[PDB]
Amino acid sequence: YTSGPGIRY
Amino acid sequence: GSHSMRYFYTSMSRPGRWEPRFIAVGYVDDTQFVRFDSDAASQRMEPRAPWVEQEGPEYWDRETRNMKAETQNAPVNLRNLRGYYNQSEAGSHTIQRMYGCDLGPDGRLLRGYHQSAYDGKDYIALNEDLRSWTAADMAAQNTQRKWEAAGEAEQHRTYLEGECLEWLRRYLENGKETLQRADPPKTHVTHHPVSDQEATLRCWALGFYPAEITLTWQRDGEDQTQDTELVETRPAGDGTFQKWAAVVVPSGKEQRYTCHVQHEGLREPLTLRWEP
Amino acid sequence: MIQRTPKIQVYSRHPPENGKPNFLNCYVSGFHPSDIEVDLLKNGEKMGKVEHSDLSFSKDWSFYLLYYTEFTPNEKDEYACRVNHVTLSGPRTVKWDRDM
C-alpha cells in the first residue's frame, strides 16, 4: 500500500 | 515472472490564486488500482480495480490520511523548491514522485525505487542500494541534506523491503485470476498503397495484456529496423492494450514480408502476412 | 524550464463496425506540463460527454491521459480529436482513421 508522507523537500 | 507496485505523485502549483493540486495514482504491473485527487469531491483514496474494493474501512482510512498529508505538504514543497531556484512566486511548477517495489521470481525484493522530478527533470533519487541519494544539482542537495538528517534513506528501505512487498503479494493473490493471467493479442494485417512503386503493410496487435510486446517485420529472415514504424503501445480502454507496426514495401513483392508478434500469452511467436 | 509536446492517437476500443456501439479513444502522451485540452469531435462538433483516465506519467516524467467517450461508427460520420497544449501553436486536430 501507500508510503508515509515522509519529510518535506 | 517479475511483478511490481508503483505509485505516481504529481504536485502542481497554479497561480493566479488556485490552491496547489495533488494527484496520486497506484499500479500493480500494468493495472491501476487506486486514485486520489485533491480537486475531487470525495477527498479519499478511491478504488480503481475490483480486487482492492474488498478492503476494510481501516485500509482506506490510512490511505486517505497519507493522501491528505501529501496534499498539505505539497504547497510547502513547491514553495521550498521555488526558493532553491530563485523562481518567482508567480509561475507554475511541478513536483513528481515515483516509488515502489519489484518482486522477483524468488519472492524477494528485486529492486526498489524512490525518485522525484522538478518540472520534468530528474531532481533527487534513491540509489539501488536504498542507502544513499543522488541529487541532480546543488538545489536538490538542499533536499538531500534534509532527508539525510531525518534518516529517510532507511525507513524507505524498510517500507520497500516489507510493506511494499507484502502488500504487492497480497494484491497479486486477490486479483490472481486477472493480474496473473496473460491475454494473448488478437492479430491481423492491413495494406494501403502509398504510391505506385510502394505500399504500406501494417501489423495489428489488439486486446493484449500485459503491455510488454514485440512487433517486427521480416524480409529474407531479416528485421526491417529503420523502415518499421512502431507506434507507442496504447490502452484499449477495457484494461488491455493495442499496438501496430508499419513498413513501406515495393508493390507486388508484398509476400516477402512477414510480421512477427511476441507476447507472453503466446506459446510460439505469432507469424502472419497480408491476406487480400 | 523545458516543455514537452503532446503525442496524439485516435482510435476505437474495439474494431470499428457500422451500427455497432463502441468507444472513441484519444490517447495523449509525452507532454509536459500536465495541463492539456482534449476534445472528441463528431463532424467538427464538440462531442457528447468525454471522460479521461487519472493523471499518470512515464519513466521519463512525461504525462499520459486517455480521453474516451461512447460512439457508434457511422458511414456518413467523421470523428477526430482536438488537442491543445502550451507547447502547440494552436489546437491540433487529428482525424480518426478506421485503419490506424
Side-chain angles (χ1 to χ4, degrees):
Chain A
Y1 62 167
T2 268
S3 161
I7 305 310
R8 297 188 197 92
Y9 294 70
Chain B
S2 62
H3 296 273
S4 66
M5 180 171 61
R6 296 278 197 274
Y7 281 96
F8 306 85
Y9 292 13
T10 303
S11 293
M12 307 156 42
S13 66
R14 48 182 184 173
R17 279 286 47 174
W18 246 307
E19 301 279 78
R21 179 185 189 174
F22 172 90
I23 301 182
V25 157
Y27 281 90
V28 166
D29 299 345
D30 289 322
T31 305
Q32 184 189 0
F33 72 95
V34 289
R35 149 184 61 164
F36 180 87
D37 187 3
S38 65
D39 270 4
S42 163
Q43 292 305 135
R44 321 198 71 252
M45 182 81 83
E46 309 168 28
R48 280 308 199 95
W51 43 260
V52 276
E53 218 150 1
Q54 296 281 136
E55 285 285 359
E58 191 170 325
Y59 170 88
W60 302 102
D61 279 350
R62 174 196 175 275
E63 303 306 313
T64 294
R65 272 182 282 281
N66 289 328
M67 294 305 93
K68 288 181 179 297
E70 294 284 2
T71 303
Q72 286 293 245
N73 285 332
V76 190
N77 287 337
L78 291 155
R79 195 268 196 82
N80 282 169
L81 274 76
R82 205 245 285 113
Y84 306 151
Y85 291 110
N86 188 30
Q87 289 162 334
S88 174
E89 5 64 22
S92 300
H93 301 270
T94 298
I95 302 181
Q96 285 159 281
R97 201 159 95 211
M98 187 283 296
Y99 67 91
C101 44
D102 282 353
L103 170 57
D106 63 336
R108 221 167 202 95
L109 187 67
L110 189 50
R111 182 161 182 174
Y113 305 91
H114 180 115
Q115 45 206 229
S116 307
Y118 187 60
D119 286 329
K121 272 208 278 285
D122 291 345
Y123 181 73
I124 192 173
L126 187 66
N127 295 325
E128 192 161 354
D129 63 7
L130 309 174
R131 285 169 156 79
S132 54
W133 299 100
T134 290
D137 58 25
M138 285 300 173
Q141 253 147 6
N142 287 334
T143 300
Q144 179 169 351
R145 247 83 173 179
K146 289 182 184 180
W147 295 354
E148 283 181 342
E152 201 72 23
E154 83 146 326
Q155 163 144 137
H156 184 81
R157 184 200 323 118
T158 298
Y159 163 94
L160 288 174
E161 292 173 344
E163 314 250 287
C164 165
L165 227 358
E166 294 157 16
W167 280 90
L168 173 53
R169 294 196 200 98
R170 160 145 195 156
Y171 299 138
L172 286 175
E173 174 63 23
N174 297 339
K176 198 200 207 81
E177 279 77 20
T178 51
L179 291 177
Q180 308 201 35
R181 185 187 73 199
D183 301 333
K186 305 152 168 285
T187 58
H188 69 253
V189 178
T190 56
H191 169 258
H192 305 288
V194 161
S195 51
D196 279 347
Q197 278 83 341
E198 289 184 334
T200 290
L201 291 171
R202 179 166 300 108
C203 192
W204 280 94
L206 300 176
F208 57 91
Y209 184 103
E212 171 55 34
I213 195 170
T214 314
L215 298 168
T216 63
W217 274 102
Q218 289 189 24
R219 182 202 192 190
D220 302 343
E222 192 66 0
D223 298 337
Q224 312 309 322
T225 305
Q226 74 258 30
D227 313 71
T228 294
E229 186 192 11
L230 288 163
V231 284
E232 179 184 1
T233 289
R234 65 201 199 193
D238 56 5
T240 67
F241 300 91
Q242 305 172 0
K243 190 190 193 73
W244 58 264
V247 61
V248 171
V249 304
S251 299
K253 300 202 196 72
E254 326 279 61
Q255 250 52 19
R256 287 228 275 178
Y257 296 88
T258 64
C259 173
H260 291 251
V261 184
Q262 309 183 50
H263 187 77
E264 85 190 59
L266 308 161
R267 303 191 184 279
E268 313 259 11
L270 228 45
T271 276
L272 27 47
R273 280 193 292 255
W274 169 46
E275 303 174 0
Chain C
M1 73 186 69
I2 69 199
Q3 306 192 304
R4 300 248 273 157
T5 227
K7 297 145 79 175
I8 314 170
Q9 286 197 67
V10 196
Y11 56 106
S12 52
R13 184 185 291 183
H14 308 281
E17 177 183 331
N18 287 317
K20 179 165 177 50
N22 205 345
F23 281 84
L24 187 69
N25 293 339
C26 189
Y27 182 61
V28 288
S29 62
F31 61 91
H32 209 279
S34 49
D35 276 79
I36 201 169
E37 272 188 303
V38 183
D39 274 306
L40 272 13
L41 299 184
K42 178 183 183 175
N43 297 318
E45 221 84 310
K46 196 158 82 168
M47 192 165 170
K49 281 318 173 69
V50 178
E51 311 196 58
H52 62 82
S53 52
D54 306 317
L55 191 67
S56 182
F57 54 80
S58 303
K59 189 194 185 83
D60 67 10
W61 307 111
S62 64
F63 297 104
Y64 62 81
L65 286 162
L66 180 65
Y67 285 78
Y68 57 103
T69 200
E70 220 151 358
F71 91 125
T72 302
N74 218 12
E75 173 74 345
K76 69 172 189 296
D77 288 338
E78 322 168 25
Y79 295 92
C81 181
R82 197 170 64 197
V83 175
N84 208 193
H85 186 266
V86 60
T87 60
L88 294 174
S89 293
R92 167 150 158 249
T93 293
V94 184
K95 301 182 181 303
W96 173 53
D97 189 0
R98 302 172 69 107
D99 314 69
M100 293 176 183

Coordinates of all heavy atoms in Angstrom, one line a residue, chain C residues 5-58:
Chain C
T5 N 6.1 18.3 -25.9 CA 4.9 18.3 -26.8 C 4.1 17.0 -26.7 O 4.6 16.0 -26.2 CB 5.4 18.4 -28.3 OG1 4.6 19.4 -29.0 CG2 5.3 17.1 -29.0
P6 N 2.8 17.1 -27.0 CA 1.8 16.0 -26.9 C 1.7 15.1 -28.1 O 1.5 15.6 -29.2 CB 0.5 16.8 -26.7 CG 0.8 18.2 -26.8 CD 2.1 18.4 -27.5
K7 N 2.0 13.8 -27.9 CA 1.7 12.8 -28.9 C 0.3 12.4 -28.9 O -0.3 12.2 -27.9 CB 2.7 11.6 -28.7 CG 4.1 12.0 -28.8 CD 5.0 11.2 -27.9 CE 5.2 9.8 -28.4 NZ 6.2 9.0 -27.5
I8 N -0.3 12.3 -30.1 CA -1.8 12.0 -30.2 C -2.1 10.8 -31.0 O -1.5 10.5 -32.1 CB -2.5 13.2 -30.8 CG1 -2.1 14.5 -30.2 CG2 -4.0 13.0 -30.7 CD1 -2.6 15.7 -30.9
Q9 N -3.0 9.9 -30.5 CA -3.5 8.8 -31.2 C -5.0 8.7 -31.1 O -5.6 8.8 -30.0 CB -2.9 7.5 -30.7 CG -1.5 7.2 -31.1 CD -1.0 5.8 -31.0 OE1 -1.5 4.9 -31.7 NE2 -0.1 5.5 -30.1
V10 N -5.7 8.6 -32.3 CA -7.1 8.5 -32.3 C -7.6 7.1 -32.8 O -7.2 6.7 -33.9 CB -7.8 9.6 -33.2 CG1 -9.3 9.7 -32.9 CG2 -7.1 10.9 -33.0
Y11 N -8.4 6.4 -32.0 CA -8.7 5.0 -32.3 C -10.0 4.6 -31.5 O -10.5 5.4 -30.7 CB -7.6 4.1 -32.1 CG -7.0 4.1 -30.7 CD1 -7.3 3.1 -29.8 CD2 -6.2 5.2 -30.2 CE1 -6.8 3.2 -28.5 CE2 -5.7 5.3 -29.0 CZ -6.0 4.2 -28.1 OH -5.5 4.3 -26.8
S12 N -10.4 3.4 -31.7 CA -11.6 2.8 -31.1 C -11.2 1.7 -30.1 O -10.3 0.9 -30.4 CB -12.6 2.4 -32.1 OG -12.1 1.5 -33.0
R13 N -11.9 1.5 -29.0 CA -11.7 0.5 -28.1 C -11.8 -0.9 -28.8 O -10.9 -1.7 -28.6 CB -12.8 0.5 -26.9 CG -12.5 -0.5 -25.8 CD -13.7 -0.5 -24.8 NE -13.7 0.7 -24.0 CZ -14.5 1.0 -23.0 NH1 -15.4 0.0 -22.7 NH2 -14.4 2.1 -22.3
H14 N -12.8 -1.1 -29.5 CA -13.0 -2.4 -30.3 C -12.8 -2.1 -31.8 O -12.9 -0.9 -32.2 CB -14.3 -3.0 -30.0 CG -14.6 -3.2 -28.6 ND1 -14.1 -4.2 -27.8 CD2 -15.4 -2.5 -27.7 CE1 -14.5 -4.2 -26.6 NE2 -15.3 -3.1 -26.5
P15 N -12.7 -3.1 -32.6 CA -12.7 -2.9 -34.1 C -13.9 -2.2 -34.5 O -15.0 -2.6 -34.1 CB -12.6 -4.3 -34.6 CG -11.9 -5.1 -33.5 CD -12.4 -4.5 -32.2
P16 N -13.8 -1.2 -35.4 CA -15.0 -0.4 -35.9 C -15.9 -1.2 -36.7 O -15.5 -2.1 -37.5 CB -14.3 0.7 -36.7 CG -13.0 0.2 -37.1 CD -12.5 -0.8 -36.1
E17 N -17.2 -1.0 -36.5 CA -18.2 -1.7 -37.3 C -19.5 -0.9 -37.3 O -20.1 -0.6 -36.3 CB -18.5 -3.1 -36.7 CG -19.6 -3.8 -37.3 CD -19.9 -5.2 -36.7 OE1 -19.0 -5.7 -36.1 OE2 -21.1 -5.6 -36.7
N18 N -19.9 -0.4 -38.5 CA -21.0 0.5 -38.7 C -22.3 -0.1 -38.0 O -22.7 -1.2 -38.2 CB -21.3 0.7 -40.2 CG -20.3 1.6 -40.8 OD1 -19.9 2.6 -40.3 ND2 -19.8 1.3 -42.0
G19 N -22.9 0.8 -37.2 CA -24.1 0.4 -36.5 C -23.9 -0.3 -35.1 O -24.8 -0.5 -34.4
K20 N -22.6 -0.6 -34.8 CA -22.3 -1.2 -33.6 C -21.7 -0.3 -32.6 O -20.7 0.4 -32.8 CB -21.4 -2.4 -33.8 CG -21.0 -3.2 -32.5 CD -20.4 -4.5 -32.8 CE -19.9 -5.2 -31.6 NZ -21.0 -5.2 -30.5
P21 N -22.3 -0.2 -31.4 CA -21.8 0.6 -30.3 C -20.3 0.4 -30.0 O -19.8 -0.8 -30.0 CB -22.6 0.2 -29.1 CG -23.9 -0.2 -29.7 CD -23.5 -0.9 -31.0
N22 N -19.6 1.4 -29.6 CA -18.1 1.3 -29.4 C -17.6 2.5 -28.6 O -18.5 3.3 -28.1 CB -17.4 1.3 -30.7 CG -16.1 0.6 -30.7 OD1 -15.5 0.3 -29.6 ND2 -15.5 0.2 -31.8
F23 N -16.3 2.6 -28.3 CA -15.8 3.7 -27.6 C -14.7 4.4 -28.5 O -13.8 3.8 -29.0 CB -15.1 3.3 -26.3 CG -16.2 3.1 -25.2 CD1 -16.8 1.9 -25.1 CD2 -16.4 4.1 -24.3 CE1 -17.8 1.7 -24.1 CE2 -17.3 3.9 -23.3 CZ -18.0 2.7 -23.2
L24 N -14.8 5.7 -28.6 CA -13.8 6.5 -29.3 C -12.8 7.0 -28.3 O -13.1 7.6 -27.3 CB -14.5 7.7 -30.0 CG -13.6 8.6 -30.9 CD1 -13.2 7.8 -32.1 CD2 -14.2 9.9 -31.2
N25 N -11.5 6.6 -28.6 CA -10.4 6.9 -27.7 C -9.4 8.0 -28.3 O -9.2 8.0 -29.5 CB -9.6 5.7 -27.4 CG -10.4 4.7 -26.6 OD1 -11.4 5.1 -25.9 ND2 -10.0 3.4 -26.6
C26 N -8.9 8.8 -27.4 CA -7.9 9.8 -27.8 C -6.8 9.7 -26.7 O -7.0 10.1 -25.6 CB -8.4 11.2 -27.8 SG -7.2 12.4 -28.5
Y27 N -5.6 9.1 -27.1 CA -4.5 8.9 -26.2 C -3.4 10.0 -26.4 O -2.8 10.0 -27.5 CB -4.0 7.5 -26.4 CG -2.8 7.1 -25.5 CD1 -3.0 7.1 -24.1 CD2 -1.6 6.8 -26.0 CE1 -2.0 6.7 -23.3 CE2 -0.5 6.4 -25.2 CZ -0.7 6.4 -23.8 OH 0.3 6.1 -23.0
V28 N -3.2 10.8 -25.4 CA -2.2 11.8 -25.5 C -1.1 11.5 -24.5 O -1.3 11.1 -23.3 CB -2.7 13.2 -25.2 CG1 -3.6 13.7 -26.4 CG2 -3.6 13.2 -23.9
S29 N 0.2 11.7 -24.9 CA 1.3 11.3 -24.0 C 2.6 12.0 -24.4 O 2.6 12.7 -25.5 CB 1.6 9.8 -24.1 OG 1.9 9.4 -25.4
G30 N 3.6 11.9 -23.6 CA 4.9 12.5 -23.9 C 5.0 14.0 -23.7 O 5.9 14.7 -24.1
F31 N 3.9 14.6 -23.0 CA 3.8 16.0 -22.9 C 4.1 16.5 -21.4 O 4.1 15.7 -20.5 CB 2.4 16.5 -23.3 CG 1.3 15.9 -22.5 CD1 0.9 16.5 -21.4 CD2 0.7 14.7 -22.9 CE1 -0.2 16.0 -20.6 CE2 -0.3 14.2 -22.1 CZ -0.8 14.8 -21.0
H32 N 4.4 17.8 -21.3 CA 4.7 18.4 -20.1 C 4.6 19.9 -20.2 O 5.0 20.5 -21.2 CB 6.2 18.1 -19.6 CG 6.4 18.1 -18.2 ND1 6.6 19.2 -17.4 CD2 6.5 17.0 -17.3 CE1 6.7 18.9 -16.1 NE2 6.7 17.6 -16.0
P33 N 3.9 20.6 -19.3 CA 3.3 20.0 -18.1 C 2.0 19.2 -18.3 O 1.6 19.0 -19.5 CB 3.0 21.2 -17.2 CG 3.6 22.4 -17.9 CD 3.7 22.0 -19.4
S34 N 1.3 18.9 -17.3 CA 0.1 18.1 -17.3 C -1.2 18.8 -17.8 O -2.1 18.1 -18.4 CB -0.2 17.4 -15.9 OG -0.2 18.4 -14.9
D35 N -1.3 20.1 -17.7 CA -2.4 20.8 -18.2 C -2.6 20.6 -19.7 O -1.6 20.9 -20.4 CB -2.3 22.3 -17.8 CG -2.8 22.6 -16.4 OD1 -2.1 22.4 -15.5 OD2 -4.0 23.1 -16.3
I36 N -3.7 20.1 -20.1 CA -4.0 19.9 -21.5 C -5.4 19.9 -21.9 O -6.3 19.6 -21.0 CB -3.4 18.5 -21.9 CG1 -3.1 18.4 -23.4 CG2 -4.3 17.4 -21.5 CD1 -2.3 17.2 -23.9
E37 N -5.8 20.3 -23.1 CA -7.1 20.3 -23.6 C -7.3 19.2 -24.6 O -6.7 19.3 -25.7 CB -7.5 21.7 -24.2 CG -8.0 22.7 -23.2 CD -8.5 24.0 -23.8 OE1 -7.7 24.6 -24.6 OE2 -9.7 24.3 -23.6
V38 N -8.2 18.3 -24.3 CA -8.5 17.2 -25.3 C -10.0 17.1 -25.5 O -10.8 17.0 -24.5 CB -8.0 15.9 -24.8 CG1 -8.3 14.8 -25.9 CG2 -6.5 15.9 -24.5
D39 N -10.5 17.2 -26.8 CA -11.9 17.1 -27.1 C -12.1 16.1 -28.2 O -11.3 16.1 -29.2 CB -12.4 18.5 -27.5 CG -12.9 19.3 -26.3 OD1 -13.7 18.8 -25.6 OD2 -12.4 20.4 -26.2
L40 N -13.1 15.3 -28.1 CA -13.5 14.4 -29.2 C -14.5 15.1 -30.1 O -15.3 15.9 -29.6 CB -14.1 13.1 -28.6 CG -13.2 12.0 -28.3 CD1 -11.7 12.5 -28.3 CD2 -13.5 11.3 -27.0
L41 N -14.4 15.0 -31.4 CA -15.2 15.7 -32.3 C -16.0 14.8 -33.2 O -15.5 13.9 -33.9 CB -14.4 16.7 -33.2 CG -13.6 17.8 -32.4 CD1 -12.9 18.7 -33.4 CD2 -14.5 18.6 -31.5
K42 N -17.4 15.0 -33.3 CA -18.2 14.4 -34.2 C -18.7 15.4 -35.3 O -19.5 16.3 -35.0 CB -19.5 13.8 -33.6 CG -20.4 13.1 -34.5 CD -21.7 12.6 -33.8 CE -22.6 11.8 -34.7 NZ -23.7 11.2 -34.0
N43 N -18.1 15.3 -36.5 CA -18.4 16.2 -37.6 C -18.1 17.6 -37.1 O -18.9 18.5 -37.3 CB -19.9 16.1 -38.0 CG -20.2 14.8 -38.6 OD1 -19.4 14.2 -39.4 ND2 -21.4 14.2 -38.2
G44 N -16.8 17.8 -36.6 CA -16.4 19.1 -36.2 C -17.0 19.7 -35.0 O -16.6 20.7 -34.5
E45 N -18.0 18.9 -34.4 CA -18.7 19.4 -33.3 C -18.2 18.9 -32.0 O -18.0 17.7 -31.9 CB -20.2 19.0 -33.4 CG -21.2 20.1 -33.0 CD -21.5 21.1 -34.1 OE1 -20.5 21.6 -34.7 OE2 -22.7 21.3 -34.4
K46 N -18.0 19.7 -31.0 CA -17.5 19.3 -29.7 C -18.5 18.2 -29.2 O -19.7 18.4 -29.2 CB -17.4 20.4 -28.7 CG -16.6 20.0 -27.4 CD -16.1 21.3 -26.7 CE -17.1 21.9 -25.8 NZ -16.5 22.9 -24.9
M47 N -17.9 17.0 -28.8 CA -18.7 15.8 -28.7 C -19.2 15.0 -27.5 O -18.3 14.4 -26.8 CB -17.9 14.6 -29.2 CG -18.7 13.3 -29.4 SD -17.7 12.2 -30.4 CE -18.8 10.7 -30.2
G48 N -20.5 15.0 -27.2 CA -21.1 14.4 -26.1 C -20.5 14.6 -24.8 O -20.2 15.8 -24.4
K49 N -20.2 13.6 -24.0 CA -19.6 13.7 -22.7 C -18.4 12.8 -22.5 O -18.5 11.6 -22.2 CB -20.7 13.5 -21.6 CG -21.6 14.7 -21.3 CD -20.7 15.9 -21.4 CE -21.6 17.2 -21.3 NZ -22.3 17.3 -20.0
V50 N -17.2 13.4 -22.7 CA -16.0 12.7 -22.7 C -15.4 12.6 -21.3 O -15.4 13.5 -20.5 CB -14.9 13.4 -23.6 CG1 -13.6 12.7 -23.5 CG2 -15.5 13.6 -25.0
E51 N -14.9 11.4 -21.0 CA -14.2 11.1 -19.7 C -12.7 10.9 -20.0 O -12.3 10.7 -21.1 CB -14.8 9.9 -19.0 CG -16.3 9.9 -18.9 CD -16.8 8.9 -17.8 OE1 -16.4 9.1 -16.7 OE2 -17.6 8.1 -18.2
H52 N -11.9 10.9 -18.9 CA -10.5 10.7 -19.1 C -9.9 9.9 -17.9 O -10.4 10.0 -16.8 CB -9.7 12.0 -19.3 CG -9.8 12.9 -18.2 ND1 -9.0 12.8 -17.0 CD2 -10.6 14.0 -18.0 CE1 -9.3 13.8 -16.2 NE2 -10.3 14.5 -16.7
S53 N -8.8 9.2 -18.2 CA -8.1 8.4 -17.1 C -7.5 9.4 -16.1 O -7.5 10.6 -16.3 CB -7.1 7.5 -17.7 OG -6.2 8.3 -18.5
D54 N -7.0 8.8 -15.0 CA -6.4 9.6 -13.9 C -5.0 10.0 -14.3 O -4.2 9.1 -14.9 CB -6.4 8.8 -12.6 CG -7.8 8.4 -12.2 OD1 -8.8 9.2 -12.4 OD2 -8.0 7.2 -11.8
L55 N -4.6 11.2 -14.1 CA -3.3 11.7 -14.4 C -2.1 10.7 -14.0 O -2.0 10.4 -12.9 CB -3.0 13.1 -13.9 CG -1.8 13.8 -14.4 CD1 -2.0 14.2 -15.8 CD2 -1.5 15.1 -13.5
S56 N -1.3 10.3 -15.0 CA -0.2 9.4 -14.7 C 1.0 9.8 -15.6 O 0.8 10.4 -16.7 CB -0.6 8.0 -15.0 OG 0.5 7.1 -14.7
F57 N 2.2 9.5 -15.2 CA 3.4 9.8 -16.0 C 4.3 8.6 -16.3 O 4.1 7.5 -15.6 CB 4.2 10.9 -15.4 CG 4.6 10.7 -14.0 CD1 5.7 9.9 -13.6 CD2 3.9 11.3 -12.9 CE1 6.1 9.7 -12.3 CE2 4.3 11.1 -11.6 CZ 5.3 10.3 -11.3
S58 N 5.2 8.7 -17.2 CA 6.1 7.6 -17.7 C 7.4 7.7 -17.0 O 7.6 8.5 -16.1 CB 6.3 7.7 -19.2 OG 5.0 7.6 -19.9

